[PDB]
Each structure stands twice: as C-alpha cells, then as structure tokens.
Design a binder for this molecule. Structure first.
Ligand SMILES: [Mg+2]
Ligand SMILES: [Zn+2]
Ligand SMILES: [Zn+2]
Ligand SMILES: [Zn+2]
Lengths: 257, 44, 79, 49, 99, 132, 115, 64
RNA sequence: ACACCCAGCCGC
C-alpha cells in the first residue's frame, strides 16, 4: 500500500466555522474533499411544493423556489433517511420525507411577514434553522398562503439548495514559495492570513524539491449541518463512493476472464 | 366554474347564460378563481 | 484513341458515383466486395471504390455533343 | 415568383438555433439539441442486414 | 428514423457571402438547446456567439449525403480557392495560449 | 470564446437571473352576423364537427381554462364553437412548444360590448445555455 | 425544452454500466477505464494515487465532454504488474487514506470540544 | 422583488438579514458598519444586502 | 383557424 498518512489540526471551532489544516497529503485529495463539501454531502431541503392557495403578490413558482432554499436542520436525521428514488414507497412516505404545512393568513392592517417560523414541520427533528427569521413573502390584509411541502434528501450536484456549505475557502502554500502562481510584481500583493514571512519580504524563495502538503480550510455552514458534520460526512461519502467503485470493478474483473 | 369580482373580490354565480355583471358593485371585469385541482411544484 | 478527357476521376465523379452505389446497395444490389462488419451503405461504397470493383461506367459530355464512356475501374482514384 | 419562390424556396427539414461554442468537438462536428434531432428525420431503406 | 450521431448535415449562416459559409458537419447530440460548433469553424462562417442564429439542413437521400460527405465536409473544404490559404485557423484563447 | 459567457450553475439554482414570461391571449365573442354566433362552451366531439387531437378535458364549464392549471405545448384554453351556416371549433391553441401555467383569466366586456376574455400564462425561465 | 434531468449527472438508468475496462492496443499492458456518471472528484484522486505508485508508467484521466458524465482513466504499467491491479491498489489506498483522515478528524473534534 | 434567501455566489443565508439591516439604517449607522454587524464578511453577501430593492413593499400598496 | 399593411427588434 503506497499511501501516506495525513494529519489534521483545528485552529478555531465556532458554530459556523470548522477551520482546519490538513498535512501530508496530495493536492488532489484535498481538492476532492473540497468538492465533496460543495457537492456530495446530503442534507434535507424542500423539493415537493403543493400550493393550496396563494393570493400574494409573488406567484407560485417564486414561493416554491424560496421555500426550496430554506435550510433545514439535518444533524443526525439525514444519515438515517433514504432517497425517495431508493425506497419502496409509492410517492412519499415518512421513512424518506418530512411533511411541512403553511397556513398563514393576514387579517390585520399592518403587513404580515411570512417568516420561516410559520412552517410547521411534522417530525420535530427537522425545522427551519432559525428556531432573524427567513421571510418568504409579505402579505397585506386579505391575503393568504396555504401550502404543503415535502423535503427529500439530496446531493449538491442535483441542486444548490442541498449545498450544505456557505463558501468553503481552500488555500494551500500561502507564502508563494512553490511557484504555482507567478506574480508580475510580488511586493504589491498582500500577504494572506496563514503567512509566515514578515512584511519586508514579498514571497518565499523557490523550492525545487517541493510538493504542496499543507491545506487550510474555512468550511462555513449555511445552517443545515453542524460544521463538524459537514466534514465528518464528506469524508464518509467520499469513502462510500470509492467503495462503490471498488466493488463495481471487482464485479467487472470477475466477469472478465 | 364561478367568478370573483375585481373591485369587491366577492364570489359570483354565472353559468354561461347571464350578462357579465357583479351582483353587488356592478363591475364589468371579473376574474376566475384558482382551480381546485392541485399541481406539483419543483422547488428545484 | 478518341479519349481526350482527363484520366483522373474528379471529386464530383467520386461524390455521385459513391452516392449512386450507396443508394443501389441500400436497394439490395449485390455487393462486389467482402463484408466484415459495415451496416451503412456509404462505408460499403467507399470500400468498393477502394477495391475498384464498382459496376458503374460514367459518360462524360464534351461541349460539342460527343460523349466519352469511361469505366470507374479504369479511372484513377484520388487516394 | 421568380426570385422569391423559384431561386429561393422555403424547405422542409430545416432548423435554426442560437449558437454557443464547444471546444470538445471536432471541426467537422456540430452539436444538435435533442428536440431538433427528434423532430427532423432521415429516411433509411431497409436492407437485409 | 430520428437523427442520430453521425448524420451528415449542411450548416449555414447568413449572409451566405462565399462557399465557406455553407459547409457540412457530422451531428453530435448534446443535452441543451443550442447548436454547438468548434471554435475554429467560426472564422469561415464569420460567426461569433453574441446571439448569432445559424441554420441546419438535413439530406434524406444517400446520394445527397454522399455528395455532402465528399464535397462539402469541414476538413475537405479548409483551404479556400479565394486566396489559396487556409480559411480555417486557430483563434481566440487557443491562439493566445499556444504562444 | 468569441463573446460568450460561462455561468455558475449553483448560482442559477440559487435564483441568479431567474425570471418569468407572461403571455396573454385575447379572444372575443363576435356574434355579428345572422346566425354566426360563437358561444363559450366546452366543445364535445358529438356536436362541433371540426376538432383537433388536442387534450380537451382541462376546460371548465364556462368554455374556459382555470388559473393554476399546468399547460403544455399545443393545448386548449378556450372553447369557441361557432355555428356553421352542426357547429365548428374556432378556439385558440397555445404557441408552438410553449409551456406555462395559467395565471389569471379575465372575463369582461370590450369596446364593442361583446363577451371578451383574456388568459395570462406564466412560465418560469431559468437561464439556459444560449440566453443573451 | 432540452434541459436534462438534474439527477442525470449522478444516476445510472437501467442498462448502462458504472465501470468498463477496455484493453488499449496502441501500447502493450495499458487499459482504459470508462467510469460512467461521475466527474472530476474521483478522477483527480485516482490519477494522483496512481501517479504515486512507482511501477505505473502512465496514469491520466479526461472528461470527454462537460455536458456528458463519463471519465476515461488510462493507465500503463510495467510488464510485471497489471493495470487493473494498479487501479485496485489505488482505490484501496484511497479508502485507507480517507478512513485514517476521518479517524484523525474525529479525534480532533473531540479534543477541541473537550477543551 | 424581495430579498433572496441565499446569496447567489457563496450560498450564505441572507434572507433573514434584510429587516435587521434596515433597522441598522434606522439606527443611524453607516451601511458598511451595518454589513459588518451582520457577519457578511465576503463581498458577495455585501453585494446582496447593499444593492437590493424592496419592490415587494411597492407591490403591497395595491389592493389584493 | 388567415392575408395584406405597418411598426419594432436580432446576426453580419
Ligand atoms: Mg454575432
Ligand atoms: Zn419512501
Ligand atoms: Zn364586485
Ligand atoms: Zn455570499
């Protein structure tokens, strides 16, 4: 087995940042981990909207689109639900769905803000994350919005509403020693956050026998997952994809010669 | 089906045999309400 | 001997002879070359042109009324 | 009649679309949308193979 | 039958100023709603992608398909007799990156 | 290359440049003539001999389509059976290969004073490849 | 009108194969792996892990078209070690990489959360 | 017409941050400090909150 | 469900 031994460190750990440093690994591994942050981490978001009544100033597709982008808490429940195309249910079942009901109606002179707090979920483990509230539509007197929504489990490849991150920042080799970007005028370029050189120098000297093994991350959560769980599920998902490829190629080699 | 008005927003009862007129405010423009059949919306 | 034409098969000659041959093979004409895995008649037409075994003779009209009958087999192909 | 309906006539089996680049195609290839492909047809003659 | 991969088509842009404005291509099916060209093919068409629309014609007789395949292909019709120079050529990014 | 734009798919999924395209179709009941009236009614295949193979079941009892109904290409949003001097269909179809949902249906009286109707169809237009 | 379904980028319908092996006859002991319905995410890591193997003479990948969803990974090794074995070793090595990294990340979370 | 739920570029939630931002304009703060009081560090979300029009408030004036 | 007339707009 010709595989090296990556290590991790964590700089600071808030409820929205999980900033970590990975050492002793390839560039491709770190980049694919970042892409799995963006794409291949499943969360729960609304995907099946049924508008019973909408007399608001915003039409039905707009309300459905703004409902899809509302994040939902999926801390543990996403790992136990299934995909709606990978279940034995007819259309939707509570084994892979969560129900949502919205029956807001304005009968006051002041305007009514249909915040995310008015989405009444069925299972009390998913909820809009602000439970500062995500408004969906403003209503005046005599306007109602009745709808039922179903939220599935999906990847960020399928849509960006399933993207759990909020702009992961991936920086390697901050002082530009390994010449992977060539500054036309190095001294006018600002030093980055993880910089070891002083203010007098511009960039680190060139390293001929050098490869990049240092990777700084700023994985930031939209709210659907804890920032621990985004990484701890991304690594699991990448491992699962590689295991699926392994067993498929084993089946291919078995029926080859 | 049945119609609602454009001024008072009150439902009316006309079935292809009556002149177009609101029963209360007498408004010549009247809309049709949203259908009872439900349509699937992809939040995608 | 009364053959004052170019002894080289022109590109228009190639185009229309392959076209006629492909349409004929599509209408179940016997193929003059061995088959080893083509379905579309155009590929069969190119193979028959390269084998120079096409059953086509072309008549070229000189600009006075007189004609000249050439065989595609006795012409010179462009490849 | 002569210029507008003998020299130049409207034709069946023709398509028109906005064009976008594709550096992953050869120079002798054109990308075609699925609806144009499903609408326009080629008449093949049933050969015994 | 429906048009599939490998069907010969004539592909044309107005104004049809010269013989290079109407050349033949092979069809590749791609899953969006636009005709996608090669980049270097845009120089004989005098085309760009700022909203140019561009026409497609399909033969349905094997003699016509053969005539386009052996007279009006893109590779066969690269060097023009207008200037005995190649009317196709490397353009834009591929030209400024090969330098 | 050559004046083209690469776009972020995730941004477009998040609402970047997403828009709707309202189209409105107008039809009036022109009862001018001796017996050439065209009453708004759902055209059944028993009478109204001139017909099409469009899907004639989404209309209402008033010869009209309802708001909030999914409408595909080449459908029917009006039932206008005009008397042949039994009757024939003079109804409008949708524009070719259009899509959308009926937003509003207006029934009113026009300048001539006839039974005038308008249908508004709304289709979302997510930015595709090929949009300027 | 011609938009593909958004799930077509990562889902196999009935009939198509996830991975195929095509022996390349231009040079001896080389193979093409046509992995379907996937993207650069596995291509880059598989290419790098095969490049790390000293008995691999060529290891590359391409995506033939961004609108399509195939990746082609070409591998050529020495005439002592079959390329399918090289791909197998690379996949299991990346499994070990990801598993060890996951364990160390979980220890890092526990150590930061405890104080 | 209304504030987007998510920033187009990154994906940070900015739907819940409109009203409070208006409050910080009602509390005589500059727009830059109002953005910095919300955690909108990247300039994409600052583009979202800074350059948005509340046309839904205009649409609410008309009768339903 | 057209046919003329007019206007506006797209690419070169
Ligand atoms: Mg142009
Ligand atoms: Zn189920
Ligand atoms: Zn009224
Ligand atoms: Zn942002």
């Amino acid at each position: 087995p010709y595989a090296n031994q990556p290590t991790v460190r964590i700089t600071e750990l808030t409820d929205e940042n999980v900033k970590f440093i990975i050492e002793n690994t390839d560039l491709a591994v770190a980049n694919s981990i970042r892409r799995v942050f963006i794409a291949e981490v499943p969360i729960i978001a609304i995907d099946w909207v049924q508008i019973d009544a909408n007399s608001s100033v915003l039409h039905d597709e707009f309300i459905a689109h703004r409902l899809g982008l509302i994040p939902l808490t999926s801390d543990d429940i996403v790992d136990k639900l299934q995909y709606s195309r990978d279940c034995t249910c007819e259309e939707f079942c509570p084994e892979c769905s969560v129900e949502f009901t919205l029956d807001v109606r304005c009968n006051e002179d002041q305007t009514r803000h249909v915040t995310s707090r008015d989405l009444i979920s069925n299972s009390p483990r998913v909820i809009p994350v602000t439970s500062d509230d995500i408004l969906i539509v403003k209503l005046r007197k005599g306007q109602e919005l009745r709808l039922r929504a179903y939220a599935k489990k999906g990847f960020g490849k399928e849509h960006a509403k399933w993207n759990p991150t909020a702009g992961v920042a991936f920086e390697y080799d901050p002082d530009n020693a390994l010449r992977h970007t060539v500054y036309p005028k190095p001294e006018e370029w600002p030093k980055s956050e993880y910089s070891e050189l002083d203010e007098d120098e511009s960039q680190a000297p060139y390293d001929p026998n050098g490869k990049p093994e240092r990777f700084y991350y700023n994985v930031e959560s939209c709210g659907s997952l804890r920032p621990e769980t985004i990484v701890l599920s991304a690594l699991s998902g990448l491992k699962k994809k590689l295991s699926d490829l392994q067993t498929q190629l084993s089946h291919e080699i078995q029926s080859d010669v | 089906m049945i119609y609602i008005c454009g001024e008072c927003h009150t439902e009316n009862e006309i079935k292809s045999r009556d002149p177009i007129r609101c029963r209360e405010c007498g408004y010549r423009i009247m809309y049709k309400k949203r259908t009872k059949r439900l349509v699937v919306f992809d939040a995608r | 001997q009364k053959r004052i034409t170019t002894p080289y098969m022109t590109k228009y000659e190639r185009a229309r002879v392959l076209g006629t041959r492909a349409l004929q093979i599509a209408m179940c004409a016997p193929v003059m070359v061995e088959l080893e895995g083509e379905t579309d008649p155009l590929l069969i037409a190119m193979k028959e042109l390269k084998a120079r075994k096409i059953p086509i003779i072309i008549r070229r009209y000189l600009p006075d009324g007189s004609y000249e009958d050439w065989g595609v087999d006795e012409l010179i192909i462009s490849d | 009649r002569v210029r507008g309906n003998l020299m130049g006539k409207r034709v069946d089996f023709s398509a028109r679309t906005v064009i976008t680049p594709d550096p992953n195609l050869s120079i002798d290839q054109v990308g075609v949308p699925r609806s144009i492909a499903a609408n326009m047809t080629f008449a093949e003659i049933v050969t015994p193979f | 039958r429906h048009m599939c991969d490998g069907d010969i088509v004539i592909f044309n842009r107005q104004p049809t100023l010269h013989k290079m404005s109407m050349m033949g291509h092979r069809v590749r099916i791609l899953p969006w709603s636009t005709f996608r060209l090669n980049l270097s093919v845009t120089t004989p068409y005098n085309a760009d992608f700022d909203g140019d629309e561009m026409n497609l014609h399909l033969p349905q007789s094997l003699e016509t398909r053969a005539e386009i395949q052996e007279l009006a292909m893109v590779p066969r019709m690269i060097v023009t007799p207008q200037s005995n120079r190649p009317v196709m050529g490397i353009v834009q990014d591929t030209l400024t990156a090969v330098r | 290359q050559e004046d083209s734009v690469i776009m972020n798919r995730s941004a477009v999924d998040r609402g970047f440049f997403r828009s709707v395209f309202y189209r409105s179709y107008k039809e009036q009941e022109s009862k001018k003539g001796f017996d050439q009236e065209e009453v708004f009614e759902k055209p059944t295949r028993e009478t109204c001999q001139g017909m099409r193979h469009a899907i004639y079941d989404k209309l209402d009892d008033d010869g009209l389509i309802a708001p909030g109904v999914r409408v595909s290409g080449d459908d029917v949003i009006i039932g206008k059976t005009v008397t042949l001097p039994t009757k024939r269909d003079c109804s409008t179809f949708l524009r070719t290969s259009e899509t959308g949902i009926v937003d509003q249906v207006m029934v009113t009286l026009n300048q001539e004073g006839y039974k005038f109707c308008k249908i508004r169809v709304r289709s979302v237009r997510i930015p595709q490849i090929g949009d300027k | 009108m011609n938009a593909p379904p958004a799930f077509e980028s990562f889902l196999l319908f009935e009939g198509e194969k996830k991975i195929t092996i095509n022996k390349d006859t231009k040079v001896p002991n080389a193979c093409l792996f046509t992995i379907n319905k996937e993207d650069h995410t596995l291509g880059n890591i598989i290419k790098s892990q095969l490049l790390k193997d000293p008995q691999v003479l060529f290891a590359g990948y391409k995506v033939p078209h961004p609108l399509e969803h195939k990746i082609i990974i070409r591998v050529q090794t020495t005439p002592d070690y079959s390329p399918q074995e090289a791909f197998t070793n690379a996949i299991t090595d990346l499994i070990s990489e990801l598993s060890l990294l996951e364990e160390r990340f979980r220890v890092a979370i526990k150590d930061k959360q405890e104080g | 017409m209304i504030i987007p739920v998510r920033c187009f570029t990154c994906g940070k939630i900015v739907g819940n941050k409109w009203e409070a931002y208006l409050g910080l304009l009602q509390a005589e703060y500059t727009e830059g400090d109002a953005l910095d009081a919300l955690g909108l560090k990247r300039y994409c979300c600052r583009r979202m909150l800074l350059a948005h029009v509340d046309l839904i408030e205009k649409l609410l004036n008309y009768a339903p």
